[PDB]
Amino acid sequence: ASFEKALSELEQIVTRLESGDLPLEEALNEFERGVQLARQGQAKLQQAEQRVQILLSDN
Template identity: 55%
Template sequence: MAEKKKTFEEAMSRLDEIVTRLEKGDTPLEESLKLFEEGTKLMKQCSGLLDKAEQKVQQLTAGADGAPVEVPFMTEGE
């Protein structure tokens, strides 16, 4: 049975748990490898979800004349 895809928030929360466990350094090697593999999959999933969200926002952004205008995302430092 295929595993249900996590929401972005669920994936990020699980990824945070994995990082915390790996940073402790007391996880056996075999389990660390499994956690690393799971974390890599979650990173790819989160990246894909963010890419889709960015594309959707760009499609929904419209200029003054109603025509779509691509507007770059601004980060807090900009």
């Protein structure tokens, strides 16, 4: 999906998690869902800076 979606979904999971509403059993399950988004957010951001680096380099 879109990168901008990943952040928006991640934030709502973060804000809802800081509110402390959920019980611990379920609270973990969304934290498991949290790391799914995090590791693909880094993946897309890494490939973005590579493309700009190769284009703008003197090579």
